[PDB]
Amino acid sequence: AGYDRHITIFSPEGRLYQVEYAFKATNQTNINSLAVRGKDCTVVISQKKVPDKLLDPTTVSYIFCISRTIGMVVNGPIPDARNAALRAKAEAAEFRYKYGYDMPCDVLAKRMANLSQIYTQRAYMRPLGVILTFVSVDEELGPSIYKTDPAGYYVGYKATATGPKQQEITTNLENHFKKSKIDHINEESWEKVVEFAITHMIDALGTEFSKNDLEVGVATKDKFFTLSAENIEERLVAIAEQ
Amino acid sequence: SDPSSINGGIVVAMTGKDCVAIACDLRLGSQSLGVSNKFEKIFHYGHVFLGITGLATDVTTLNEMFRYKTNLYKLKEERAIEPETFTQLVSSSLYERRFGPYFVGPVVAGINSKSGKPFIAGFDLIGCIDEAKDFIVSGTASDQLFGMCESLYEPNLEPEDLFETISQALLNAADRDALSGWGAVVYIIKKDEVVKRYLKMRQD
Amino acid sequence: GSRRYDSRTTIFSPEGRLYQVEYALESISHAGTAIGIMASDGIVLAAERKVTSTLLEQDTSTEKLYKLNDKIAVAVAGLTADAEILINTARIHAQNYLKTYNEDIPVEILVRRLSDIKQGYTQHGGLRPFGVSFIYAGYDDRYGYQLYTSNPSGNYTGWKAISVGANTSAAQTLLQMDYKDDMKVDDAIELALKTLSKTTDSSALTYDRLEFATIRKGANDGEVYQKIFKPQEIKDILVKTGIT
Amino acid sequence: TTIVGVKFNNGVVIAADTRSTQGPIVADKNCAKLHRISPKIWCAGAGTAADTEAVTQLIGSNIELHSLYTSREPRVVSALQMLKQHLFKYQGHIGAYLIVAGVDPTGSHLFSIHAHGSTDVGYYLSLGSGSLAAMAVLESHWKQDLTKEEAIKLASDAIQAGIWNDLGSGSNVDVCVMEIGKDAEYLRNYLTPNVREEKQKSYKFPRGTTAVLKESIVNICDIQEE
Amino acid sequence: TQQPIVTGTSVISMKYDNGVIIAADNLGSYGSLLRFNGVERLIPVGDNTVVGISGDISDMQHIERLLKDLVTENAYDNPLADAEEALEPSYIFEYLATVMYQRRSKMNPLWNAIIVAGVQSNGDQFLRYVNLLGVTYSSPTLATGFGAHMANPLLRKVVDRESDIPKTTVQVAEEAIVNAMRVLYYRDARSSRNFSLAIIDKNTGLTFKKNLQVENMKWDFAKDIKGYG
Amino acid sequence: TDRYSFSLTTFSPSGKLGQIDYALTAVKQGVTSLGIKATNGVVIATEKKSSSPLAMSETLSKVSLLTPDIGAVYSGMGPDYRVLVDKSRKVAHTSYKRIYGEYPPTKLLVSEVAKIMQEATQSGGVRPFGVSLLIAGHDEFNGFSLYQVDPSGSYFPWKATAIGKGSVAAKTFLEKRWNDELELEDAIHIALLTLKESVEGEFNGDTIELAIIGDENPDLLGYTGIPTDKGPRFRKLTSQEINDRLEAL
Amino acid sequence: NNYDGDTVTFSPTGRLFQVEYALEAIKQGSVTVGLRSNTHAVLVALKRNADELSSYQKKIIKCDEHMGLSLAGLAPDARVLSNYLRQQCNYSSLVFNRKLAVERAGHLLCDKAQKNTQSYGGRPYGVGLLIIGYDKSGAHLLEFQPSGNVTELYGTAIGARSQGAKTYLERTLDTFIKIDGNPDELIKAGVEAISQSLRDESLTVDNLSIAIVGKDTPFTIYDGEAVAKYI
Amino acid sequence: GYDLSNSVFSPDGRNFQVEYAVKAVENGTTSIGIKCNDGVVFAVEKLITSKLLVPQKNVKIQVVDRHIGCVYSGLIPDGRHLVNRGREEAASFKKLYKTPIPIPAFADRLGQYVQAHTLYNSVRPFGVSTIFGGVDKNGAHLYMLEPSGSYWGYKGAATGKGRQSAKAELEKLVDHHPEGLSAREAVKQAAKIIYLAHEDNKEKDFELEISWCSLSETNGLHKFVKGDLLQEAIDFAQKEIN
C-alpha cells in the first residue's frame, strides 16, 4: 500500500525503510568515537565540540554513566541519547534488585536490544536514532565492548569506532591489530591506552586536538570514571614525549 | 468438623510384580447418615488410575477437572498420558488452590507401558508428591491401613497374591472404621488388561 | 496520527458487502482440495496435501486433519496459522460443554460456536477474518452422522456430500453424478479417491500426498471408531481402487 | 527432619534424611528432600513439604531462564534473592525453611532462608526440626578449613545424632558434595542406619480366601476395531 | 488500624486583646521511656499563624509537610497573590480539617489534635480546634490532650467570655500561659521542662520565643510530711 | 491517543496476505542455514557473518538453546530472531514446566511458537517476524524430529531442509545426499559439504556454527550420582572439533 | 487539508490552523462588551433571537454570587466550560473556605483548553468567555480565547464588530476608571459602548442583557423590565 | 508527506514536525537568562498591545518550587501546560526525598516529558522554548530547553525574535567580564539588552519584567524585581539607547 514507511511494515523488497532512516539520523552531531581494549582496562574517546561560546562546556557531554562499571557512549541526537540513558539506568537498578549482583554489560546490551526490537515492531513507536557503545571491564569476560544499533542488532568487538568518518578509524585499527597479531593491546596501565587511542584518532581524523576538544571515559576494574580536562591535557603532553 | 471427615472414604494402593492394585470402599455418606453405597472413587484416564479421598464435592470436581486436561493432552500429543506426568499434573493443580485449598487425597496408580514399571504416587491436601515404591494410602482411616499394609506386604508379589493381600488389608481396616465399610472394589491392574472385582464384605 | 492510516476493512461496500470475506474465499481456492462424503455407515474425509517433496516428512504430518474430540474431526482448508487457534478454541469449548453437562457435545453446537467466533471478526474490531474453511465429520445420537461445512463469514450448511478448497465446482459435479443415497464406507472411500484423482494438480495421486481419515460404525452398539490412517494403509486402499 | 549445611574451603557439603512424616504417622520412608535449583546449586528444604517442593520448582524454572539469558552460569545469590522476594509477599503464609548451598565462579556459598523472608549467613547452618541435635555435635567437632573427607564425615554423623535424638528424623542419610570446579556428586544412601528386621513368618494367603460378590471386565486399553 | 505509638503531651493557648498566644512543651514520649528530648511541636505557617500539632510525632511529620505545600500552592501567581491573597488562619484550619476527616472515614486515622492560632487580614482573633474525629469548635480558650481539662480551667478562669478579652492585656495572658505550663509540669507524668512559646500579634506579626524554661517551682514543703500517714 | 488495534495485515484482492509474502522475500535476503535429520541424531549448521571483520563472532550466536533437547537456528532477521528465542523459552517454561514440571516434546514447543507468529500476523500494531526457523529436537516418543516454522505461522516436518538465499541449490543437493539410513558422522560431513557450496568466505570452524541434537552427555550434566536424569542431547561444537571435520571431508 | 486538517499537525508557518478556525467561532458570535471600574464590573451582552416566535437565547451564566461569565460563540461548548468553573469555585469554598480567585481560574481554564489541543481526537473549544468578578483584590475582567489565552483588561469586547467597541473604550477609558461607587454610570457607558456595535439591531428591553458585580452587591443579572432604567 | 507526524523519519535525518515547532518559538518575544556568579537573572519583554490593558498585571515568568524560575517563549498557553507539569514533578521529588529538587534533576524531568511527545502519533510536540534556572546548594545553574527535547548548559541564553541582537550582546558581556559579574549588576544589563532586542520589534510598545534568583540578595529564593530598583533599570537602558 501507499504506507510502508510511515509504519514499520515490509516493502515489496521484503524490507524496513523506516529503520534505514533511523540509521540515517545517527550522523547529525557528527561526533566520532574510538574505543579500544587494553589488557585490564577499556578506553573510549569521543569528540567534544561547542558551536558557540555561550554554552557551558562541562554540561556538553556524550559519555553517560549508566552503571558503576558500564559506561555508555552515544552516537546520534541528544534527545534520544537521554531517553536511552534513562531506559538503561532503570534496567540496571532492576537487575541488581532481582538477582543480587550488578548488571553485566552483556545482559544490558541484550536487554536494550530487545527494547529496540519492540520499537520497530509496534506501529506507533519511533525507533531510537542512536548507536550505543557499552564499554565495561567484566571479571568473567574481561574488558569488553558491545555495540547496539537502532535495528536491535548487537555485536561484540575487539575495538570499534562510530561516526560519519569512522572508516578512517577502521583502517587504523585494522592495521594496528594486524601488526600486533592479537585482539587487544598488551598494556598494563590505563593511561598509556588513553595515549594510544588519542594517537590513532589524530592520525585518522587528520586533526590535532586540545583538552576542550576531547572527551575521555575509562572503565577500569570495579569502576568507571571520566577524566576532566586537566588530566586530558597531561595525556596530550605525554604523547609528544613518546 | 473437618471437611474430609464428613464422608470418610479410603484408598489403598500397592505395587506388586509387573502389576499394581488400587482399591476403595463405596460408602458415601453425610455425617451419621450413610447415603449411597454405589459411588466409585476410582476413576481412570486412559490407563492411569486416579483414586480420590476426602471431601465429597471435591471428589467429583477434581474428577471432571482432570478429565478436561487429559483430554487436551491426548488431542494434542496424540498419546495416552503416562502416570508420571499425571503425578506432576496433580501436584500443580492442587497447588493452584493454595488459598481456598482443596480437601482431598489423590492416589495415582499406573504402570509405565514403556518399560513395564509399576508406578505409584501419593498426595494430601495441598500437594506434596509422596514417593513410594512399596505402597500408598489415603483417606480418613489411613492409620489402620498403614499398619495392615506394612505388616502383610512382601516385595515383588505375584498378581493373584497381590489380590489376596490388598483385599484383606482393606476389609479389616474398613470394619475398624465408622466412615467406611459399605462395600469395596479392588482393581487388579495388569499390563494388558484390568480386572474389577467387588468384594463381599460385611455391611455395617 | 492513527485515524489517518486506518483502512476500515469491516465497512460495507456499495454492494452491501465485505471484500475481506471474498478475498479469504479467493485465497482458500489456492489451498488444497478437501472432500467429505457421508455414507449411511460412516463418514469419509479425504484431503490432499498442498506440498509434497521427497524430502518432506509426511509421517508425523496431520496438517489438514485434526481431532476436535473423539467423536468429531475436521478437514481444514486455508491459512493453517489462523486455523490452529480455532482448533484449540474448539477443543476448549468441547471440554467446557462436557464439563458442565457431563455429556458429549452435539455437532450442531460446536459448528455454530465456531461460526460465531468467525462472525465476531467481521462484525467489529477492524480486524481481518480468519481465512479457514472447515468440513466437520461427527456422530451424535440425536441426528446420527452429521456433515457440515463452514466458511470465513461464519455461516454453516449441512450437506450430503461436499468439497472445499481448489476446484469446488468440478468435484461437486462429480459427486452429483456418482452419489448414492445410501453407500458403504468402502464405496465412499472409492468415490473419494476417484474424485481426488480427477481434480489433482499433479498427474498422479499418491498416498504420500493423501491425508485420509474416517469415522466408522465398525465399532458396535453405539461406539464409533475414529481412524486417522497411516500412509501405508492409504497405500493399500489406493491399490484396491486400482489407481496405483 | 534434620538438614546440615557444612562449608569448607574446597566446597560445601549438604546432607539430609529421608523420613517424611505426617504427624505421628510416617508418611514416607524414602523421599529426597534435596532439590536442584541448578546442577551446581542444590538446596534442601524443611518445614511444609508441599511448600518446599513447589517453590524450588518455581524458582528452578526462573533461574534456568535467567541463566539462558545471560549465557552465563547461575549464582547462589540469584536464587536466594528470588526466594526471599517470593516468600516475603505472602507475609509468611508459605512455610519454607531452606538451606541453599552452591558453588559458582565466585566460590563456595551457604545461605539459610526462613519462612518470613529472613536470611542468614554462616559457614555452618542447620535447619529443620532436628536442627538442635545436629547443632550440638556440629559445634564441638567443627573447625575452619576442613577437607571433603572430613566434612562429609561431620555432616553424616550430625544427621545420625539427629535420627537418634529426634523422632521426625530417621532413614538413610543422603549427602550432596559440591566442590568448586567439579561436577556435583550425589551420595545418596551414603550411610544406612536402620534396616528392617525379618518377619518371623510369611503372611501370604491361599487363593480364594476372600469372597467375591460379583466380577466384571472393563478394558481401558483402547476404543475398538472390530 | 492506627493507634498512638510516639506521642507528645499537650498544646495550650489563649486569646488576648490584639491577638493570640500559643505554646507547647518539647517532648517526644515513647511511653514511659522519654525517648526524644528537644522536639518542637509548634510549627509556623505564614507569618501570623502558628499551628500546634498534638498526638503522634509520626503523623505530625506528614502534616508538617502539607502546611509547607499549601504555602507553595498559594504563592503561585501574580506578586499580589502572596502579599494579599496570602493564606489566612481560617484557610489553614479548613485544609487540615478536611484531610483529617477524610482519613477518619477511610478508617486509617491521622491521630492528632490540632490548634490553629492566628489573626485575620480583617484584624480579628482566630483560635480553633480540630481532631481525629473531625469535630471542630472555636472558643476563647483552647487546649488539647491532657491539658484539655488540666491547664484549660486556669486559662478559662482569666477570660470567661469573649467580652472580657478587650479587658485582658497581653502581659496578663503571658502570665497565665507560663503559670499553666508550670501546673502541667507538676501534675502530669509526661512533661518536659522545655517549652516553645509563640505570640501572634496583629501590629507586629509573629514573634517566636523559643526554649523557655519553667522556673519558680515549689518543693519546699515535701519534707514536712512523711510516709503514707 | 492510540487507535492501532485494526490489523495492518489484510487479504490482498488476488487472494493472499501481502505481508507474509514480503516477509518470505526477506528470508531469502539473509544468511544460509540447513538441517539434516540422521537416524541417530540431527545436525544443524549455519554461517557466522558480521558487519566488520574486526567484530567478534564468538560472543554472538545463531544456534540458540531453547531446551537441553531442543535447539533452534534461523535464516532471516537477527533482531527478530533474538526476541523470539527468549519468548520461546518463556512459554516453554510457564506452560509445560510448571504444569508437568519437565521440558516439552519438540512438537508441542513448535506449536507454542507458531501461536506467537500467528498473533504477530493478527492484531493491529504488529507485522510478522521476518524469519524462518528450524526447530530441531528430540523427544522420547517420536525420536529425532526436525521442523520448519515459516513467517506464516504454519510448520512442516522435514527429513532435511535448508533456509536462506542459497536454499534452492542446497535443497537440490540434499535431494541426492539424503539416505534412508544416515550416520550422524556422515551427516556432519554432508552438512559441511553442502554449506560449503553456499559460502564464499573463509571456511573454518570459527565461521561455521555446528550443533548436534545427537546423544546424551553425562559430562554436560553438571552433577553425578543421578542415573535417572541424563545429560543434554543438544551440544554446541566449539571450533576445535569442527576444524577436524574440515579435514575429514 | 495539507497542513490544515488536524489538531496534531504543523504547519511550516509555525502555526496551527485549527486555532484560527476556532476563532472564527468568535467572529460569527454576537457582540458582547465588558468593562470594569475599581468598584464594579459590568458585562453588557447582546442577546439574539432566532425569529419572532422564538425568544432570545441567554448569554450570561451565573457562576457564583460574586462571579459571572458570558459566552461568545458556540453554546454547546460554553456549557462544558461553565460547569467546570462552577465546580472548582464550589471546591474552593469547600476545601479552603475561600472564594475562588479570578486570576487563578483563568489558568485552570487555560490548561483545560491546552489538553484538547494536545491529543489527537480533541478539538479547541469554539467559545470565548468574558469572566468578571469581585474578590479580595477587587474587580477583575478576564478575556478567554479559543487559544487558551487569559488576559486582564480594563474593558474589552468579543463578537462581531468587536473593533467598534474597542475604539469607543479607547476614548472613554479614563472616564469610567474615575467613576466608583456609582454603578449606574458604568452601566450606561456599557449601553453606549454596545450601541457602536449594532447592525441596526436596536436595543430593546429584552434584547439587552446586563449583569453586574460590586463591592457591596452580589452578582446580579438584569433582564426584562430591570434593564429599562438604562435604556 | 514525512511532515505529517512526529514518529516518522526522513532519509535526511529530518523529522519535519519538530523543526516546524521552532518556527512557533520564533514567534515569541525576547526572553533572556543571564547566568551570574551569584545566581540567575531572567527578563521578559511584555508587549503592550492596547491601551485597554491593565499594566503589570500579567506574569510571563512563573516560579517552580521556590528556587527555580521558569520563563518561556513561543505559545503562551502551551508553555503554561509545561510549567504546570514541572510543578507536579517538583512536588513529587520534594515529598519523596525531603529536599527541594536540584536544578539538573529538574532538567532531566522536563527534558524527558518533552522528548515523550515525539514518540507517539497521539500527541503534538510542544512549541515552546523554556529557560529555567536558579540557586541550589551545588550552585546557580541555567538551562535552555528546546521544543526538540534538547538542552545544554549556558552562561547566557536567549530566545524570541530579538534573539539575534541578544546573543551578540551576551557575547560582549562575557567579553567584558570573563570572570563574571554580580546579579546586582545584571539587573541593569537585562534591561539594556531587552531594549536593544526591541528595534527588530519596533512596531509596538512594551513593559519590562525582570526577576532573579540569587543567593546574595534574595537568599536563594526566586523573587521579582520591583519598585525603585525596577524603574532604575528601566531608566538605565533608556539613557543608553538614546
From Swiss-Prot, chain E:
Q: Which GO annotations describe the biological process of this protein? A: proteasomal ubiquitin-independent protein catabolic process; proteasome assembly; proteasome-mediated ubiquitin-dependent protein catabolic process
Q: Which UniProt keywords apply?
A: Cytoplasm, Nucleus, Proteasome
> Which Pfam families does the annotation name?
Proteasome (PF00227)
PROSITE patterns attached to this UniProt entry: PROTEASOME_BETA_1, PROTEASOME_BETA_2
Which segments of the protein form a coiled coil according to its record? none
InterPro entries membership: Ntn_hydrolases_N, Proteasome_beta4, Proteasome_bsu_CS, Proteasome_sua/b, Proteasome_suB-type
Q: Which CDD domains match?
A: proteasome_beta_type_4
| Tagged with keyword Cytoplasm | yes
Q: Name one GO cellular component term.
A: cytosol
What the entry lists under Gene3D superfamilies is as follows:
Glutamine Phosphoribosylpyrophosphate, subunit 1, domain 1
| Compartments in which it is found | Cytoplasm; Nucleus
Q: What does this protein do?
A: Non-catalytic component of the proteasome which degrades poly-ubiquitinated proteins in the cytoplasm and in the nucleus. It is essential for the regulated turnover of proteins and for the removal of misfolded proteins. The proteasome is a multicatalytic proteinase complex that is characterized by its ability to cleave peptides with Arg, Phe, Tyr, Leu, and Glu adjacent to the leaving group at neutral or slightly basic pH. It has an ATP-dependent proteolytic activity. PRE3 and PRE4 are necessary for the peptidyl-glutamyl-peptide-hydrolyzing activity.
- Tell me more from the record: Present with 16900 molecules/cell in log phase SD medium.
Self-association and partners:
The 26S proteasome consists of a 20S proteasome core and two 19S regulatory subunits. The 20S proteasome core is composed of 28 subunits that are arranged in four stacked rings, resulting in a barrel-shaped structure. The two end rings are each formed by seven alpha subunits, and the two central rings are each formed by seven beta subunits. The catalytic chamber with the active sites is on the inside of the barrel. Interacts with CIC1.
Task: Provide the family line.
Answer: Belongs to the peptidase T1B family.
**Name under which the protein is recorded:** Proteasome subunit beta type-7
Gene that produces this protein = PRE4
